[PDB]
RNA sequence: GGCGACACACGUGCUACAAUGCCCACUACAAAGCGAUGCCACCCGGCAACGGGGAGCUAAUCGCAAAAAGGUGGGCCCAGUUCGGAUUGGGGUCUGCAACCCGACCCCAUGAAGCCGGAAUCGCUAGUAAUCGCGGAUCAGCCAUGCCGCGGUGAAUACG
RNA sequence: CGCGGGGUGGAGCAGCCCGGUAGCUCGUCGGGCUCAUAACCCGAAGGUCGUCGGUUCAAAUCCGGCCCCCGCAACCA
RNA sequence: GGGUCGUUAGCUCAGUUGGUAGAGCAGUUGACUUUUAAUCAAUUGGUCGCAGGUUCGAAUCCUGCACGACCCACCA
RNA sequence: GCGGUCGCCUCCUAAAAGGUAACGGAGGCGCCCAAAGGUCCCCUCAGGCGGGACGGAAAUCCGCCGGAGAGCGCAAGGGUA
């Protein structure tokens, strides 16, 4: 990426309805997740 | 340069696709280039300074500063002097493509009301697939206390797949919630 | 944080801020507040993610909510019509469904008045 | 509006339908009992109901489950103004 | 108000009894 | 079956648009008429409608009964908002031969218009108006917000 | 054949000229006051601008043709 | 192009200490009536040819320059 | 006479060089741009079909296809990726 004034994109951590989500790598690290349709209520693995 | 889904493509998505279609060459197997995100905004036209929240919060969720579209021709119905900015278009590749693409699949699409799955027919027949979003706050980096106003985008994803079949296969096996 | 769909409520009360979730209010609230044991008088701005997940999870699983619910309320309708049923006509072409009186004010179900002319 | 200990169906047609239900054959019977319930068992028949004026045929499905027999035989004429 | 069948003030108005106006 | 139609138009009213206000708990004060074909205290199940049971009174005895406002304490914090309950989905109660047309009520979900109403125009001179309940007739049930009545608290203003 | 102006809600006028949106009176519709009607008051509705091309980003608006309309003219012979 | 002159919060204006800021029809409010009026009675700052430069201060003087109204002249 | 016209550009007329007339057929000019100029370096159209939130034939984005039908400030012709 061309060098100057452009978001950092540093490894991060995020959650789910179940436990954590790994891969991450986001600028503005450490965010939060209400729901996951793959942790999966609310779609997959139906109900 | 690591990026879990990138890895999961090479180890376990690639071979499943070789077993399934079968391939003389390592190259023929569909690879994944260029997920390009485009916000068409009339939403900011005569006021073009509304843009740069929508541009800065684009770069926040992709991790890349978008460039700015402008107007092909002048169309009188909505405004549209041949000059003005319509929206942002950011091209994503290579890691930075995946780093965003996994965050898309583990977070974004979960966070939509409903989400009965991704429409299966959006493959363009030459074996790319694009879709479109509304509330940008389905993303992690968007807190709904940073939203001035909602606007979506159109996400196109391109693939070295020559056909639509293999397009869905590549995307399914990358864990694309589908129908 | 947020309930089914998104529907973030905030500040004010918790029991109160629950009505602002669709498919819920008063009754379906004050009870699901004890069934998580959470204080109803709590102020949804301040409270522990503890209380949130036990509340967010209870509600999202328990009963059908708008993303799913509104889909289903509409679903009875297209069935209540398209069958040929009576209420289905009052739906089909858009008049009041349960008894009542159409000679004078329907106004809610009828829209605003389109006036014409006398004898 | 329920009954429940109840579920009233006039026995004019109820006999004819239960006899048509297990019959071997079916055609259209014409009743005045719209005050009935319809089914659980009546489904699949054509039946001519009455509006005050004449006898209207009704094809029957399960979407017609509990719905009293005349919801499907309307009493009015409109076509607007 | 006196028209909410879900309130005390309302049921009193109609004259009826319920979970919001038990006898 | 209709009298219950609905592009519309007028009349009479009810509930309202909120903080002298709404919601919850607790505690208090009436008059009048009805009712042993009925009114059902009281126990039980039911969130509840109501269903059970069941005691009393031809009733200054026993029952409808709860009066409401208020009073007290607590909550709401000026929001189309805990205002407001129209509309609609769903679940049941009961009357009745039967509740689709077309019933009343309970609960769940839904929460609409409406932020004091254009030209106009109504009532009221005192225990009146406003506002708050309650009874009765008709009646199986009920579309009563009606009408006939009853007490509760209780203004303003008349130069002329 | 000739030169000039015009065709816009039911009527009568603006707007065209200077591209971007259509206005004014009357009529009409709903309400008001009245025993009632007019008068009067409060509200509203209603049109693609003769037509057909073209121009432009956009045409009642600018250009060409045609269709009507009104006006002037047609003299020495 | 010369000469005079302007120049004004919605509009017209009316203001040359260096102070504020209006006076009329307008707009809203509010009495009055019926109708139309006519009378009455209530307002934010709106940093007033434009940037500059005079001073204790300039809507508010001085050069600038954009403009307008007026008037003279002249046009191979 | 009245009407029209009167200079300049483009197209035909014009007879395959030039030129060429009529009150022959058709249109345009009396400007515009301090970038719409110089140069260096990039870039390649219109259109059609599929795809894709609010996007509809037309805003933007993504594919294939597209040798010039686009663009070149304005008329026509020549020219031109
Ligand atoms: Mg491809
Ligand atoms: Mg009714
Ligand atoms: Mg309420
Ligand atoms: Mg009240
Ligand atoms: Mg009838
Ligand atoms: Mg009648
Ligand atoms: Mg009716
Ligand atoms: Mg009424
Ligand atoms: Mg109990
Ligand atoms: Mg005695
Ligand atoms: Mg009683
Ligand atoms: Mg509203
Ligand atoms: Mg009123
Ligand atoms: Mg008197
Ligand atoms: Mg009563
Ligand atoms: Mg126009
Ligand atoms: Mg009239
Ligand atoms: Mg002569
Ligand atoms: Mg001449
Ligand atoms: Mg001449
Ligand atoms: Mg030649
Ligand atoms: Mg030659
Ligand atoms: Mg050039
Ligand atoms: Mg194209
Ligand atoms: Mg397309
Ligand atoms: Mg070309
Ligand atoms: Mg050419």
Swiss-Prot record, chain A:
Top-rank taxon, per record: Bacteria
UniProt keyword list: Metal-binding, Ribonucleoprotein, Ribosomal protein, RNA-binding, rRNA-binding, Zinc
Protein known as: Large ribosomal subunit protein bL31
Chain residues that bind Zn(2+): 16, 18, 36, 39
GO molecular function terms attached to this record: metal ion binding; rRNA binding; structural constituent of ribosome
Function: Binds the 23S rRNA.
UniProt keyword Acyltransferase, yes or no: no
Organism: Thermus thermophilus (strain ATCC 27634 / DSM 579 / HB8)
Cofactor binding mode and count: Binds 1 zinc ion per subunit.
Record note on quaternary structure: Part of the 50S ribosomal subunit.
Coiled coil: none
UniProtKB/Swiss-Prot annotation, chain B:
Keyword tRNA-binding: yes
Top-rank lineage group of the source organism: Bacteria
Gene3D superfamilies: 3.30.1440.10
SUPFAM superfamilies reported for this sequence: RL5-like
UniProt keyword RNA-binding present: yes
UniProt function note: This is one of the proteins that bind and probably mediate the attachment of the 5S RNA into the large ribosomal subunit, where it forms part of the central protuberance. In the 70S ribosome it contacts protein S13 of the 30S subunit (forming bridge B1b) connecting the head of the 30S subunit to the top of the 50S subunit. The bridge itself contacts the P site tRNA and is implicated in movement during ribosome translocation.
NCBIfam families reported in the protein's UniProt record: PRK00010.1 (NF000585)
Protein name: Large ribosomal subunit protein uL5
Originating species: Thermus thermophilus (strain ATCC 27634 / DSM 579 / HB8)
Taxonomy of the source species: Bacteria, Thermotogati, Deinococcota, Deinococci, Thermales
Gene that this polypeptide is encoded by: rplE
From Swiss-Prot, chain C:
Gene Ontology molecular function, alphabetical: rRNA binding; structural constituent of ribosome; tRNA binding
Protein family according to the UniProt entry: Belongs to the universal ribosomal protein uS13 family.
Keyword Ion transport among UniProt keywords: no
Entry function: Located at the top of the head of the 30S subunit, it contacts several helices of the 16S rRNA. In the 70S ribosome structure it contacts the 23S rRNA (bridge B1a) and protein L5 of the 50S subunit (bridge B1b), connecting the top of the two subunits; these bridges are in contact with the A site and P site tRNAs respectively and are implicated in movement during ribosome translocation. Separately contacts the tRNAs in the A and P sites.
Known partners and oligomeric status: Part of the 30S ribosomal subunit. Forms a loose heterodimer with protein S19. Forms two bridges to the 50S subunit in the 70S ribosome, contacting protein L5 and the 23S rRNA; these bridges are straddled by the 5S rRNA.
Start and end residues of each stretch annotated as Disordered: 94-119
Residues spanning the membrane: none
Keywords: Ribonucleoprotein, Ribosomal protein, RNA-binding, rRNA-binding, tRNA-binding
Name of the molecule in the record: Small ribosomal subunit protein uS13
One Gene Ontology CC term in the entry: cytosol
Keyword Cytoplasm: no
Gene Ontology biological process terms from the UniProt entry: translation
From Swiss-Prot, chain D:
Gene3D superfamilies for the chain: 30s Ribosomal Protein S19, Chain A (3.30.860.10)
A GO term, aspect molecular function: structural constituent of ribosome
InterPro entries: Ribosomal_uS19, Ribosomal_uS19_bac-type, Ribosomal_uS19_CS, Ribosomal_uS19_SF
Keyword set includes Transport: no
UniProt keyword terms in alphabetical order: Ribonucleoprotein, Ribosomal protein, RNA-binding, rRNA-binding
UniProt keyword annotation of Ribonucleoprotein present: yes
An annotated GO cellular component: small ribosomal subunit
PROSITE patterns: RIBOSOMAL_S19 (PS00323)
GO BP annotation list: ribosomal small subunit assembly; translation
UniProt xrefs under Pfam families: Ribosomal_S19 (PF00203)
Quaternary structure, from the entry: Part of the 30S ribosomal subunit. Forms a loose dimer with protein S13.
Family statement: Belongs to the universal ribosomal protein uS19 family.
Function: Located at the top of the head of the 30S subunit, extending towards the 50S subunit, which it may contact in the 70S complex. Contacts several RNA helices of the 16S rRNA.
Protein name (Swiss-Prot/TrEMBL): Small ribosomal subunit protein uS19
Protein source organism: Thermus thermophilus (strain ATCC 27634 / DSM 579 / HB8)
């Amino acid at each position: 990426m061309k060098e100057g004034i452009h978001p950092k994109l540093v490894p991060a951590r995020i959650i789910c309805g179940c436990g954590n989500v790994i891969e991450t790598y986001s600028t503005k690290p450490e965010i939060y997740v209400e729901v996951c349709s793959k942790c999966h209520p609310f779609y997959t693995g139906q109900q | 340069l690591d990026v879990a889904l990138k890895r999961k493509y090479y180890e376990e998505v690639r071979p499943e696709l070789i077993r399934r279609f079968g391939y003389q060459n390592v190259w023929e197997v569909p690879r994944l280039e260029k997920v390009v995100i485009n916000q068409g905004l009339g939403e900011a036209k005569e006021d073009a300074r509304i843009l740069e929240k929508a541009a800065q919060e684009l770069a926040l969720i992709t991790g890349q500063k978008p460039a700015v579209t402008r107007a092909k021709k002048s169309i009188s119905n909505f405004k549209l002097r041949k000059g003005m900015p319509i929206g942002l278009r950011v091209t994503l590749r290579r890691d930075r493509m995946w780093i965003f693409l996994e965050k898309l699949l583990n977070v974004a699409l979960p966070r939509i009301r409903d989400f009965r799955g991704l429409n299966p027919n959006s493959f363009d027949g030459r074996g790319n697939y694009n879709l479109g979003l509304r509330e940008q706050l389905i993303f992690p980096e968007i807190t709904y206390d940073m939203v001035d106003a909602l606007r979506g985008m159109d996400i196109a994803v391109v693939t070295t797949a020559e056909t639509d079949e293999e397009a869905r296969a590549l995307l399914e096996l990358l864990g694309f919630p589908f129908r | 944080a947020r309930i089914a769909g998104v529907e973030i409520p905030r500040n004010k009360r918790v029991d109160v801020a629950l009505t602002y979730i669709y498919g819920i209010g008063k009754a379906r609230a004050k009870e699901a507040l004890e069934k998580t044991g959470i204080n109803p008088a709590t102020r949804v701005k301040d409270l522990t993610e503890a209380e949130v997940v036990r509340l967010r999870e209870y509600v999202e699983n328990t009963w059908k909510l708008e993303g799913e619910l509104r889909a289903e309320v509409a679903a009875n309708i297209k069935r209540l019509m398209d069958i040929g049923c009576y209420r289905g006509l009052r739906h089909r072409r858009g008049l009041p469904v349960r008894g009542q009186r159409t000679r004078t004010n329907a106004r809610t179900r009828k829209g605003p008045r389109k006036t014409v002319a006398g004898k | 509006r329920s009954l429940k200990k109840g579920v009233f169906v006039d026995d004019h047609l109820l006999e004819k339908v239960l006899e048509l239900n297990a019959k071997g054959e079916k055609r259209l019977i014409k009743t005045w009992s719209r005050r009935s319930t319809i089914v659980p068992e009546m489904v699949g028949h054509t039946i001519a109901v009455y509006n005050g004026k004449q006898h209207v045929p009704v094809y029957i499905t399960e979407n017609m489950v509990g719905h009293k027999l005349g919801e499907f035989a309307p009493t009015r004429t409109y076509r607007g103004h | 108000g006196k028209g909410d069948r879900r309130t005390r003030r309302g049921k009193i108005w109609r004259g009826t009894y319920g979970k919001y106006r038990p006898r």
